[PDB]
Design a protein around this ligand. Structure first.
Ligand SMILES: [Ca+2]
Length: 483
C-alpha cells in the first residue's frame, strides 16, 4: 500500500493547470518591472581568447588538452561575441528583452588574476554595458563564471584561500568601473559545479579528481570569495551606487520516489547537500549542521570572522534550474566517505520524462515551481532571480540548420517552465523578480563542446551568422504580452 511514481500534490492550487491554460487565462500576469532576459557566459561566447591582452583561463588550458572536450572543441573563437557584441545587443533589442545576464572574463580584465588592469579588456565590458543601456536592456553581471585565470589555477585555484582574496580584489575593480551602470551583481555561478565537476570528478577545468575532500574545500573557498566580494560591495559601493548583489546557486528539484518518510527525507537531504551547502552559509552564517556531522573532518570549518562575513551576504537569491531527480532512501547503510555517499540517497529519473541532449536534463516543468517554493520557505521569502533555465534539443546539431530553427521542444520547455514559475509567483507567493533563459546563443557547452545547443538564436559557427529560432519568437511575444 506504498504509493510510488506519483508526484501530484493533493489540494495544490493550480496544480493541474497546463501551460496552455496558464497563458490562455486573462488573470495571468507577472510582477511589475519583471526582468525577462537571457543569459550567457564569457568563455562560452566571446572568443578572442588570446587577443587584446586577455590572459589564459584554466578553461583555455583545459580545452587544449586532447580528450577533455568532446570533439576537440575549444572556446578560442566560440560565437566571436567579443567582436560581434553590437549585433548581438541589437538582436536582444529586437526580441524586447528587458535584461541580459553576462559574465566578465576575469583574465580579460586582469590577465594574471591580480595586479594591473588590461585596458582593452576593461574597455570591452564598458562598451558592452553602454551598448545594452543605449538599447534599453538592463545589464546584469556575473563576476565568476568558471574562467579562473590560469595563473591562479596554477597556485591551487579554489583549493587555495588566496584565490578568494584575489576574487574580492577583482570584484572591487569591476564595481568601481561598471557599478554606476550595473545594479545587479552575481558573485559566483554554480559553485556546486565548479567544486564537483572541476575539482572532484575532473570533467571540468581544472580537471582534478578527489570526491572525498576536494568538493568541500573548493566549495569552502568559493564561499569565502563570495563573502569578500559582498563585503567590498556593501562597504565601498552599495550606498553610492544603489545596486544589489547575490550568488547564483543551482540544483535539480528533488522529488521523493515513493510516499514514504525515508524517501521524503532522502529528497530533502539532497536539497540540503546541493543548495543549502552554499545558501545556509550565505543566509544563516554556517554550513547545515547535518552536513557538518555527516562529513566530519572532510568539511572545513569557518572562523568566527568568516561566519560574520557570510551571514546575510545576499540581497537576492539567484537560482539556476533545469531538471528534476527522484530520490530514494537507501535500503542498506551507506558509509560517509565522499560527496555522493555523504548525502545518503539513490538518484534516478522517471523513464517517462523527456530528456534534453544530455542525460542530466530531464524535462519536468513543475520542478521549477517546487524548488522556488522550497527556497521561499527556507530562506525567509527572498527576492529570487531565475538566472538560468533552458533546453538542449536532442541531436539538434545533426538536424539541418533549417529544421533546428523549428525548435518545438524548446518552445514547449520555455512555456512549461515559465508557466510553473508563474504558479510559484501567483499561488505560492515566491518573490521572483526575473527570468533569464539559457541561452541567447548556441555556444560552447563546456566539456560537451559546440555539439550541444541551448540557444534561442542559432549560430552558424562557419560564418558566425545568427538566426532566430521559433523559441526566440515565442519568447519575444511572451515578453510583450506580459511586459
Ligand atoms: Ca567606451
Amino acid at each position: 500500500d506504498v504509493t510510488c511514481w506519483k508526484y501530484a500534490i493533493p489540494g495544490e492550487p493550480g496544480g493541474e493547470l497546463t501551460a496552455e491554460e496558464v497563458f490562455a487565462s486573462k488573470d495571468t500576469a507577472f510582477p511589475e518591472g519583471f526582468l525577462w532576459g537571457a543569459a550567457t557566459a564569457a568563455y562560452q561566447i566571446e572568443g578572442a581568447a588570446a587577443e587584446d591582452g586577455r590572459g589564459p583561463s584554466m578553461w583555455d588550458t583545459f580545452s587544449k588538452i586532447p580528450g577533455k572536450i568532446d570533439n576537440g572543441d575549444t572556446g578560442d573563437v566560440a560565437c566571436d561575441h567579443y567582436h560581434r557584441y553590437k549585433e548581438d545587443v541589437k538582436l536582444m533589442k529586437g526580441m524586447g528583452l528587458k535584461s541580459y545576464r553576462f559574465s566578465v572574463s576575469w583574465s580579460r580584465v586582469l590577465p594574471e588574476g591580480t595586479g594591473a588592469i588590461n585596458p582593452k579588456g576593461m574597455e570591452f565590458y564598458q562598451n558592452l554595458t553602454n551598448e545594452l543601456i543605449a538599447n534599453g536592456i538592463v545589464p546584469t553581471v556575473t563576476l565568476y563564471h568558471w574562467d579562473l585565470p590560469e595563473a591562479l589555477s596554477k597556485n591551487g585555484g579554489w583549493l587555495n584561500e588566496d584565490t578568494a582574496v584575489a576574487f574580492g580584489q577583482y570584484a572591487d575593480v569591476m564595481f568601481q568601473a561598471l557599478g554606476d551602470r550595473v545594479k545587479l551583481w552575481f558573485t559566483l555561478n554554480e559553485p556546486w559545479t565548479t567544486a564537483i565537476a572541476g575539482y572532484g570528478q575532473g570533467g571540468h577545468a581544472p580537471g582534478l579528481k578527489n570526491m572525498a575532500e576536494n568538493p568541500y574545500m573548493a566549495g569552502h573557498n568559493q564561499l569565502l570569495g563570495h563573502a569578500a566580494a559582498v563585503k567590498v560591495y556593501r562597504e565601498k559601493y552599495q550606498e553610492k551606487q544603489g545596486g544589489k548583489i547575490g550568488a547564483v546557486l543551482s540544483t535539480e528539484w528533488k522529488e521523493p520516489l515513493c510516499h514514504t518518510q525515508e524517501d521524503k527525507d532522502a529528497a530533502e537531504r539532497s536539497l540540503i547537500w546541493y543548495l543549502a551547502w552554499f545558501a545556509d552559509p550565505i543566509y544563516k552564517g554556517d554550513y547545515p549542521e547535518e552536513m557538518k556531522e555527516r562529513v566530519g573532518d572532510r568539511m572545513p570549518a569557518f572562523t568566527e570572522q568568516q561566519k560574520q562575513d557570510l551571514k546575510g551576504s545576499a540581497d537576492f537569491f539567484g537560482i539556476n534550474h533545469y531538471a528534476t531527480n527522484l530520490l530514494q532512501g537507501p535500503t542498506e547503510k551507506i558509509g560517509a566517505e565522499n560527496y555522493f555517499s555523504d548525502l545518503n540517497g539513490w538518484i534516478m529519473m522517471d523513464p517517462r520524462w523527456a530528456v534534453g541532449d544530455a542525460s542530466w536534463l530531464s524535462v519536468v516543468p513543475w520542478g521549477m515551481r517546487r524548488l522556488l517554493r522550497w527556497i521561499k520557505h527556507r530562506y525567509d521569502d527572498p527576492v529570487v532571480y531565475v538566472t538560468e533555465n533552458g533546453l538542449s534539443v536532442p541531436n539538434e546539431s545533426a538536424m539541418t540548420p533549417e529544421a533546428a530553427l523549428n525548435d518545438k521542444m524548446r518552445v514547449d520547455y520555455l512555456q512549461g517552465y515559465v508557466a510553473e514559475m508563474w504558479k510559484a509567483i501567483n499561488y505560492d507567493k515566491v518573490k521572483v523578480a526575473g527570468y533569464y533563459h539559457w541561452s541567447l546563443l548556441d555556444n560552447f557547452e563546456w566539456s560537451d563542446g559546440y555539439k550541444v545547443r541551448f540557444g534561442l538564436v542559432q549560430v552558424d559557427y562557419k560564418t558566425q551568422k545568427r538566426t532566430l529560432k521559433e523559441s526566440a519568437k515565442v519568447y519575444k511575444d511572451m515578453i510583450a504580452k506580459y511586459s
